[PDB]
Design a protein around this ligand. Structure first.
Ligand SMILES: *[C@@H]1O[C@H](CO)[C@@H](O[C@@H]2O[C@H](CO)[C@@H](O)[C@H](O)[C@H]2NC(C)=O)[C@H](O)[C@H]1NC(C)=O
Ligand SMILES: *[C@@H]1O[C@H](CO)[C@@H](O[C@@H]2O[C@H](CO)[C@@H](O)[C@H](O)[C@H]2NC(C)=O)[C@H](O)[C@H]1NC(C)=O
Ligand SMILES: *[C@@H]1O[C@H](CO)[C@@H](O[C@@H]2O[C@H](CO)[C@@H](O)[C@H](O)[C@H]2NC(C)=O)[C@H](O)[C@H]1NC(C)=O
Ligand code: NAG
Ligand code: NAG
Ligand code: GLU
Ligand code: GLU
Lengths: 499, 100, 457, 88
C-alpha cells in the first residue's frame, strides 16, 4: 500500500504512527509517471512485488488517479483516494472498488441549497457546464429542490470552450440570483462575459464552487461575489493520518482473513477479502479522527464535513461563515455584495412587463382586423361610452397580422392594469385551441398542448381567457378566485312556431 | 362518459364560431359547451335554444404561472372588483344586454 | 491501417487464431493480424508491445470470460492511445458504463435500458403488472429503478419494489413479504445463486411464479426469462466486428483521408463515425458507444435446463412464439363463457390505434384474435370478480347459442359448462327446469319470460 | 357531545378520507362569522386567525378583507346577496 503523491518521509512517519497505534502498517509508495501508461505499469509492478492488502493522492497538476482505481477494480482490491474532487469517481459503475475521503462538488451543490433555504432566496438560476461533474451537481440540486414545491427557474447549459447569449437570457428573466458551476477557465470566460454586460451590478448576487473562485481570483474575480471552499482545503497530511487510521481500524475489524492477493502477475481472479473489507468500511464509522466523525457515505463519500463560506473583497477572501455537514454558521463577520449593498437583496425582480395570451372566444374576447393605418375604429357603446380596445398580434403558418381586440376580458384586463401598475402586450395563441395536456407522439411523456404552452413554456406570463377550472390545470399552473360562475349546457336548433 | 367521449371525438370541431355556424346550418345534432358563451349566443342569435341542467358548476379563472408573486394581488383585486359594482357593471353592458 | 486481433482465451483462442486469417479475408483492402497471450500486467504489456510493433487502424478484442473486469482497463488503454477498440462476444463488451472524454470503446453488449424496454414489450402481452421489482443493491440498481419508474407511467399494473441484502431466512421473509406472481430481479451471478437458493427455500420457485432476470450476466426456479443480443458463433462475431471496423475506417478515410492512429506509444474522441449495416442487423452506435436499435432475443428456461429462443425484437417490433397466453395463477381461475346478445353483451373490434380494448371493457378471445366485450353482463361480472377475486377469461362460444338436447347432448353455453370446458357461464341465459336440474343456477337478478311484440300502435 | 351532520360535515369527512388526518369538530361560541370589532376578529375567522383552530369549514362566505387576512380554498357552492319576498 502507498500513496503516489518529501512525501516519502511523510508516508514513513504516517506508517510508523499507524504501527504504534499480523504485521501492521507496511508502507510501499512510488512516484507519479509522466505517462499514465507508465503509472499503470509501476502500479502493477509494485502490486505484484508486495502484498498491498490502496491509498493514492491527487498531485497538484488536470491529473488523473484513474489508472490505479482501474487496476484496483481489475483486482477488486479496495482503493481509497485522498484529494480527488471530480464526481465521476463517485460512481461505482466503473469504480465499484473506489472510495474517497473528500466530498465532491455535489455536496457543494447541497450546501448551496442549504444557504438558499437559509436566506429565503426561493427563486434560482443555474449556469452549469455541460461536463459530467456539472450535470451531476445540477441533478443533485434539482432533486434536493424536488421535495420543496419549487423548481429551478431556468437552467442554462454552457458547453466547455462566448456565453453572452446565455447571460442575456438570464438577464431578461425575473430571477436575479444565479449559481455557477464550471471549469476554472470557463468560469473566467463567463466572468468576463458577465462583466462586459451590466449583469454584475447590484441585485446580481451569485456564488460558485471552490475551483471557480480560485481561478477567478487568479484572473478576474468579480468583486463582491460569494464563494465556497473546503474548510481544510488541500490539507494532505491530516487526510493521510485519518486514512491510515481508518485503514488500521478496518484491518483490525477484519481480523476472517481470506487471502490478500500478492504476486498477481497473471492471477486473473478476484479476492473476496477485497469486497468484504469494502463492505465493512462502508458499514464502518471511524471515530475521534483528525477531521471529526469520519463517516463514509453509502456511495463512498464523506458525511458531515466542514466548509468555509467566504466572500470576495478586492482580491481578498473573508470567511463570512462556516457551513457544517448539516447547517451553516450564520455570520462570523460582515458580508459585502457586488453592488455594495449592505443587506441580502431579494433574489427575484417583479417584472413591469407582462406577456398576456388570450384566445378568441365570442362573448369575452372580440377580435377584429385593424384599420387601414393599423389603428382601431373609435366606436361607442349605446350608452355613449367608448370601448377601450387594445391592439395585439397573433392571428393569421401565416404571418402574425396585428388586430384589434376588445371585450369583457379586455375590460377586466384594463381594470387590473389600472389597479396594479402594469405594462402589457397582448397576443393571441397561434394554435388557436384551449390547450389541454396531451401525450406527445412516439413517446410516453406528455406536455401542455395549445395556449397553455404559451404559459408553461414561458411564452406568456398570465393567461387571461374564458379558462375553466379543472384538475390537471390546477395541478400544473396556479389559478385565482373565479370572476364568473358558469356550467356546461346543451345548444340545439329549434323551430318554435307552427303555421 | 368515456365511451360517450370516444364517440364524440369523431366529430369534435376546432373552435366555437364554426360550431355555432354548423349548428345554425343543422350539420350537427347537439352541441355541448360553456354556459356563459351559449347564453350570450342565444341572447343574440335567436334561432337555437339552450337546455339541460348545468353539469359542471366550476367558475372561470384568470390563469397564471405557478407560485408567481402576483397570485395574491390578482386574486384579491378580482375578488374586490367582483364584490364591488364593477363586475356587475362590466357584465350588464357587455353580456345579457339583448333579449330579442 | 491493419486490424489487430487479441483474445484472452487460454485454449480456444489458439484454434480461433489458427482459423482467423481465412475468415478475416473472407469478411476496403486493409490487412488483418492476430496476436494472443491471455492479468492487467500481461494485458497492458502485451497490448503495448503489439501496438508499438504493429501499425494498426482498429483493434478487436474477443473473449467471454470474467466479464466485469476487463472492460474498464481496456477502455482506459484505448482512451490513452486514442485508438478504436471493439469488444465482442460478451466479456468486456457485456459491461456498459458511462464513458470518458477521449474514450472510444464501442462496446457491443446491450444496455440495461434496452433490456428493460424489451422485457416490458414482452410484458403487456403476458402480464399487465410488473408486480415485483427486486434488486440486490448492485451498482446499476439506481438507474434500474429510475428506468422502471420512467416506463411505468402512462397507458401498467405494479405492486412493489424491494432490495435484498445479498441470514438467508431474514431476506427470504423480506422477499416473501410482497405478494406478486411476476418478479424481475437485478443481480449478479455471485448474488444470483444465493438469492435463488433462498427463494427456493421460501417456496417462490414453483411453476406459478416467473422470474425475469435482467442483471448483466449470461436449486433453479422454473420460468427464468432473460434477454441477449445474439451468438451461441465466435467466427461470425469476429467477422461482424472486423466488418464494422473496416466500414468505420473507410468512412474515416473518405471524410478526411488520413491515418487513424495518433502516436501515443510513449507520450512525452472519435466515437461519432460509428449508419452501419451487416448480417441483416443494425450496427449504428450512440455517443456512449453502445448499439442503437439492436437485434435482440429473449430466452427462457426449459425442464431440460437449456436456453431456448422465445421471441425476437428488431426495428422496434416484437415477434414471439405461441402468442396466446393465460394467467394460470397457481383457486382463482374461472373460465367465463358467454354468448352474444346485443342488449346485454356487446362485442366490438379491438381499438387498432392502441391495439387493445378501450377502457370500460374486457378483452375477449373467441373460439385467437381479441375483441372487446362490454355492457351489462360484462360489468356485473367484473364487479363480482372485484368483490370476490379471481382470474376470469372471456372464452366465447361458437357451437350453439343457448343450449339444446340435440341427440341427447347439450350445446351452447350450457354444453360448455356441462362438460367442464368452461368453469361458469354468465350473460344472456334463461332458467328452465331441464337446465336447472342438469346444471346449478345462481340467484336470478333480471326477471324475464315470454313476451309478445307487435307492430306500430 | 353532539352529533354534527349534513353538507359541510359530509364534504369534510370525504376530504379527510381522500387526504388523511385527525379532525375534531371544535364548535365556536364567540361570534358567528367574523367582524373587525375593535380591530379584532371573532367567530370562525377569529378562531382561525389566532391559530386556535387549524382550519374552518362550513357556512362561510369569501370577502376581500377575509381573503387578505386569511387564505381561502377554491369555492364550490356559489352564492351571494339575494332578495326573498312574501307569497307570490
Ligand atoms: C514490507 O515493507 C518492506 C520494506 O519496505 C518491503 O520490502 C521491500 O519490498 C519491495 C517491494 O516488494 C522490494 O522491492 C524490496 O526489495 C524490499 N526490501 C526489503 C529490504 O525487504 C516489503 O515488500 C513489504 N511487504 C509487504 C507485504 O508489503
Ligand atoms: C390560421 O391558419 C391555421 C393554419 O391553416 C388554421 O389552422 C388550421 O385549421 C384547419 C381548419 O380546422 C385545420 O384543418 C388545420 O389542421 C389547422 N392547422 C393548424 C396548424 O392548426 C387556423 O384555423 C387559422 N385561423 C384563423 C383565425 O384564420
Ligand atoms: C402586491 O400588493 C402589495 C400591496 O400593495 C404590494 O406591497 C406594496 O409594495 C410596494 C412596492 O414594493 C410598497 O411601497 C408598499 O409599501 C407595499 N405595501 C404592502 C401593504 O405590502 C406588493 O408589492 C404587490 N406585489 C406584486 C407582485 O404586485
Ligand atoms: C459572441 O460571439 C459571436 C461569435 O463570435 C459574435 O457573433 C457575437 O457578437 C459575440 N457577442 C458578444 C457580446 O461578444
Ligand atoms: C403606480 O403608478 C402610480 C401612478 O403613476 C404611482 O402613483 C405609484 O407610485 C406607482 N407604484 C408603483 C409601485 O410603481
Ligand atoms: N334467453 C334465451 C335464449 C333466447 C330466447 O329464447 O329468447 C335462453 O336463455 O334460453
Ligand atoms: N354566510 C355569511 C354569514 C351570514 C350572512 O351574512 O348571510 C358569511 O359567511 O359571512
Amino acid at each position: 500500500i502507498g500513496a503516489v503523491l518529501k512525501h516519502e518521509q511523510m508516508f514513513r512517519e504516517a506508517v510508523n504512527q499507524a504501527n504504534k497505534r499480523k504485521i501492521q502498517l507496511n508502507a510501499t509508495s512510488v512516484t507519479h509517471k509522466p505517462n499514465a501508461i507508465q503509472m499503470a505499469l509501476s502500479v502493477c509492478e509494485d502490486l505484484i512485488s508486495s502484498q498491498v492488502y490502496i491509498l493514492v493522492s491527487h498531485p497538484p497538476t488536470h491529473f488523473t488517479p484513474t489508472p490505479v482505481s482501474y487496476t484496483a477494480g481489475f483486482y477488486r482490491i479496495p482503493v481509497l483516494g485522498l484529494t480527488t474532487r471530480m464526481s465521476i469517481y463517485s460512481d461505482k459503475s466503473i469504480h465499484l472498488s473506489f472510495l474517497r475521503t473528500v466530498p465532491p462538488y455535489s455536496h457543494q451543490s447541497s450546501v448551496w441549497f442549504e444557504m438558499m433555504r437559509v436566506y429565503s432566496w426561493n427563486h434560482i438560476i443555474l449556469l452549469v457546464s455541460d461536463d459530467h461533474e456539472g450535470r451531476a451537481a445540477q441533478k443533485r440540486l434539482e432533486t434536493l429542490l424536488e421535495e420543496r414545491e419549487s423548481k429551478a427557474e431556468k437552467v442554462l447549459q454552457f458547453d466547455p470552450g462566448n456565453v453572452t447569449a446565455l447571460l442575456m437570457e438570464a438577464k431578461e428573466l425575473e430571477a436575479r440570483v444565479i449559481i455557477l458551476s464550471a471549469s476554472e477557465d470557463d468560469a473566467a470566460t463567463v466572468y468576463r462575459a458577465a462583466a462586459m454586460l451590466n449583469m454584475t451590478g447590484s441585485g446580481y448576487v451569485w456564488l460558485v464552487g471552490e475551483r471557480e473562485i480560485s481561478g477567478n481570483a487568479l484572473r478576474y474575480a468579480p468583486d463582491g461575489i460569494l464563494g465556497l471552499q473546503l474548510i481544510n482545503g488541500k490539507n494532505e497530511s491530516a487526510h493521510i493520518s485519518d486514512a491510515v487510521g481508518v485503514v488500521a481500524q478496518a484491518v483490525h475489524e477484519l481480523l476472517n482473513i481470506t487471502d490478500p492477493p500478492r504476486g498477481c502477475v497473471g492471477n486473473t481472479n478476484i479476492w473476496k477479502t477485497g469486497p468484504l473489507f469494502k463492505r465493512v468500511l462502508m458499514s464502518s464509522k471511524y471515530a475521534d479522527g483528525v477531521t471529526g466523525r469520519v463517516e463514509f457515505n453509502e456511495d463512498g463519500d464523506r458525511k458531515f464535513a466542514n466548509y468555509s463560506i467566504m466572500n470576495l473583497q478586492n482580491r481578498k477572501l473573508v470567511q463570512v461563515g462556516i457551513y457544517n455537514g448539516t447547517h451553516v454558521i450564520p455570520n462570523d463577520r460582515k458580508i459585502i455584495w457586488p453592488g455594495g449593498e449592505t443587506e441580502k437583496p431579494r433574489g427575484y425582480q417583479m417584472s413591469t412587463r407582462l406577456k398576456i395570451v388570450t384566445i378568441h372566444q365570442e362573448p369575452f374576447v372580440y377580435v377584429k382586423p385593424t384599420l387601414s393605418d393599423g389603428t382601431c375604429k373609435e366606436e361607442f357603446t349605446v350608452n355613449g361610452d367608448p370601448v377601450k380596445k387594445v391592439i395585439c398580434t397573433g392571428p393569421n403558418p401565416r404571418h402574425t397580422v396585428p388586430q384589434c381586440c376588445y371585450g369583457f376580458c379586455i375590460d377586466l384586463l384594463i381594470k387590473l392594469a389600472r389597479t396594479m401598475n402594469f405594462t402589457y402586450e397582448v397576443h393571441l395563441v397561434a394554435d388557436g385551441k384551449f390547450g389541454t395536456q396531451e401525450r406527445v407522439n412516439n413517446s410516453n411523456k406528455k406536455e401542455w398542448n395549445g395556449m397553455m404552452g404559451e404559459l408553461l413554456s414561458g411564452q406568456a406570463d398570465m393567461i387571461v381567457a374564458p379558462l375553466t377550472i379543472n384538475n390537471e390545470r390546477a395541478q400544473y399552473i396556479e389559478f385565482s378566485k373565479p370572476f364568473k360562475y358558469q356550467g356546461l349546457t346543451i345548444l340545439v336548433k329549434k323551430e318554435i312556431p307552427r303555421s | 362518459l368515456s365511451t360517450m367521449y370516444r364517440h364524440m371525438e369523431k366529430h369534435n370541431y376546432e373552435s366555437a364560431a364554426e360550431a355555432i355556424q354548423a349548428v345554425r346550418d343543422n350539420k350537427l345534432h347537439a352541441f355541448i359547451w360553456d354556459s356563459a358563451v351559449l347564453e350570450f349566443e342565444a341572447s343574440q342569435k335567436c334561432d337555437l335554444v339552450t337546455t339541460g341542467e348545468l353539469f359542471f358548476r366550476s367558475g372561470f379563472g384568470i390563469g397564471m404561472r405557478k407560485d408567481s408573486p402576483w397570485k395574491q394581488n390578482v386574486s384579491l383585486s378580482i375578488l374586490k372588483s367582483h364584490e364591488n359594482g364593477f363586475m356587475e357593471d362590466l357584465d350588464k353592458t357587455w353580456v345579457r344586454y339583448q333579449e330579442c | 491501417l491493419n486490424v489487430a486481433l487479441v483474445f484472452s482465451g487460454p485454449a480456444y483462442a489458439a484454434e480461433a487464431a489458427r482459423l482467423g486469417p481465412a475468415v478475416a479475408a473472407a469478411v476496403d483492402v486493409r490487412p488483418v493480424a492476430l496476436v494472443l497471450n491471455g492479468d492487467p500486467r500481461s494485458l497492458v504489456l502485451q497490448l503495448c508491445d503489439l501496438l508499438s510493433g504493429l501499425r494498426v487502424h482498429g483493434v478487436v478484442f474477443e473473449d467471454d470470460s470474467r466479464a466485469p473486469a476487463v472492460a474498464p482497463i481496456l477502455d482506459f488503454l484505448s482512451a490513452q492511445t486514442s485508438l478504436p477498440i471493439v469488444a465482442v462476444h460478451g466479456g468486456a463488451a457485456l459491461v456498459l458504463t458511462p464513458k470518458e472524454k477521449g474514450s472510444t470503446f464501442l462496446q457491443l453488449g446491450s444496455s440495461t435500458e434496452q433490456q428493460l424496454q424489451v422485457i416490458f414489450e414482452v410484458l403487456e402481452e403476458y402480464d399487465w403488472t410488473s408486480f415485483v421489482a427486486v434488486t440486490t443493491r448492485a451498482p446499476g440498481h439506481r438507474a434500474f429503478l429510475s428506468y422502471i419508474e420512467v416506463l411505468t407511467d402512462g397507458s401498467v399494473g405494479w405492486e412493489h419494489r424491494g432490495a435484498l441484502t445479498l441470514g438467508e431466512a431474514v431476506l427470504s421473509a423480506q422477499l416473501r413479504s410482497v405478494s406478486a406472481q411476476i418478479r424481475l430481479l437485478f443481480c449478479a451471478r455471485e448474488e444470483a445463486e444465493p438469492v435463488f437458493r433462498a427463494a427456493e427455500e421460501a417456496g417462490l420457485t414453483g411453476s406459478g411464479y416467473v422470474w425475469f432476470m435482467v442483471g448483466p450476466q449470461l436449486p433453479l426456479p422454473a420460468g427464468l426469462f432473460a434477454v441477449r443480443s445474439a451468438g451461441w458463433d465466435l467466427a461470425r462475431r469476429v467477422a461482424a466486428g472486423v466488418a464494422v471496423v473496416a466500414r468505420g475506417a473507410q468512412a474515416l478515410l473518405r471524410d478526411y483521408g488520413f491515418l487513424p492512429e495518433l502516436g501515443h506509444d510513449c507520450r512525452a474522441s472519435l466515437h461519432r463515425y460509428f449508419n452501419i449495416t451487416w448480417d441483416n442487423r443494425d450496427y449504428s452506435f450512440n455517443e456512449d458507444g453502445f448499439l442503437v436499435n439492436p437485434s435482440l432475443v429473449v430466452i427462457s428456461l426449459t425442464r431440460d435446463r437449456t436456453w431456448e429462443v422465445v421471441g425476437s425484437w428488431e426495428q422496434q417490433t416484437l415477434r414471439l412464439k405461441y402468442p396466446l397466453w393465460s394467467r394460470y395463477g397457481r383457486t382463482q381461475h374461472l373460465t367465463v363463457a358467454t354468448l352474444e346478445e346485443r342488449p346485454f353483451v356487446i362485442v366490438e373490434p379491438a381499438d387498432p390505434i392502441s391495439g387493445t380494448c378501450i377502457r370500460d371493457s374486457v378483452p375477449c378471445r373467441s373460439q385467437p384474435e381479441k375483441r372487446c366485450c362490454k355492457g351489462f353482463c360484462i360489468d356485473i361480472l367484473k364487479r363480482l370478480a372485484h368483490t370476490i377475486g379471481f382470474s376470469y377469461d372471456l372464452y366465447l362460444v361458437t357451437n350453439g347459442k343457448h343450449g339444446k338436447k340435440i341427440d341427447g347432448v347439450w350445446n351452447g353455453m350450457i354444453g360448455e359448462v356441462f362438460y367442464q370446458r368452461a368453469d361458469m357461464a354468465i350473460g344472456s341465459l334463461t332458467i328452465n327446469e331441464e337446465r336447472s336440474e342438469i346444471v346449478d343456477f345462481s340467484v336470478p337478478f333480471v326477471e324475464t319470460g315470454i313476451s309478445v311484440m307487435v307492430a306500430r300502435s
